Write a protein that binds this ligand. Sequence first.
Ligand SMILES: CC(=O)Nc1cccc(-c2nc(C(=O)O)c(O)c(=O)[nH]2)c1
Ligand SMILES: CC(=O)Nc1cccc(-c2nc(C(=O)O)c(O)c(=O)[nH]2)c1
Ligand SMILES: [Mn+2]
Ligand SMILES: [Mn+2]
Length: 181
Amino acid sequence: MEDFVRQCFNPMIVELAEKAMKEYGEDPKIETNKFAAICTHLEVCFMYSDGGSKHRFEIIEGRDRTMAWTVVNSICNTTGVEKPKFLPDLYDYKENRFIEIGVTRREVHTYYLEKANKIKSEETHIHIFSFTGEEMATKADYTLDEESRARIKTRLFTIRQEMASRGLWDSFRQSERAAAE
Ligand SMILES: CC(=O)Nc1cccc(-c2nc(C(=O)O)c(O)c(=O)[nH]2)c1
Ligand SMILES: CC(=O)Nc1cccc(-c2nc(C(=O)O)c(O)c(=O)[nH]2)c1
Ligand SMILES: [Mn+2]
Ligand SMILES: [Mn+2]
C-alpha cells in the first residue's frame, strides 16, 4: 500500500501528505490507509481548484496550518464572510463561500451529515465525492460544471480499481468506519 501510494500520486502530493501526517506524529509507513486517503483528498482538492476559471479558488488545504489561518482571516476581513470554526479546503471567489471537500469510501449522505454537523456553519459549502461515482453538495449546487466533476469521479474510480487489482481496496474501504469509531 505504501509503495502503491508513492507511485499512484505525484511526489508533491505525497510530500504534502507525509508532512500532514508528521505534523500529527503519525507514521505513513504504518498507517498506510490514512496515507492513501490523505493523498486522495489532496488530489481531489487540486483537481477541484483547477476546475474553475483561472483565479476562482483560493486553496486553503495543503498549507501549513498557521498560514492557512492567515489566508482565511484575509478572505474574511475582505469579503465580510463569517470566520469558519475549522479549516475548510478552498475559497470560491465567484460564489463568495468557503468549500469543504469530502471523499468517502462509505455513503455520500452519511459523510455529508458528519461534515455538516461538525462545522455547524450555514455559509460553508460542502461537497462530497465517493469512490463509486456519486456526489452530494449543499443545496444541490455542485459549483463546477459537469465536465470537471466527471474527471474527478473517473480518477477516484481508477484509484479504486488499481487498489482492488492489488488486493488493497477491501482494507481501504473497511478502514473508514474504523476511523470514525
Ligand atoms: C478521508 C479522506 O479521504 N479525506 C481525508 C482527509 C484528511 C484526513 C482523512 C482521514 N482519514 C482517515 C482514514 O483512515 O481513512 C483517518 O483515520 C483520519 O483521521 N483522517 C481523510
Ligand atoms: C470523518 C472521517 O471519516 N475521516 C476523517 C477524520 C478526520 C479528518 C478528516 C478530514 N480532515 C480534513 C482536514 O482539513 O483536516 C478534511 O479536509 C477532510 O475532508 N477530512 C476525515
Ligand atoms: Mn481540509
Ligand atoms: Mn476536506
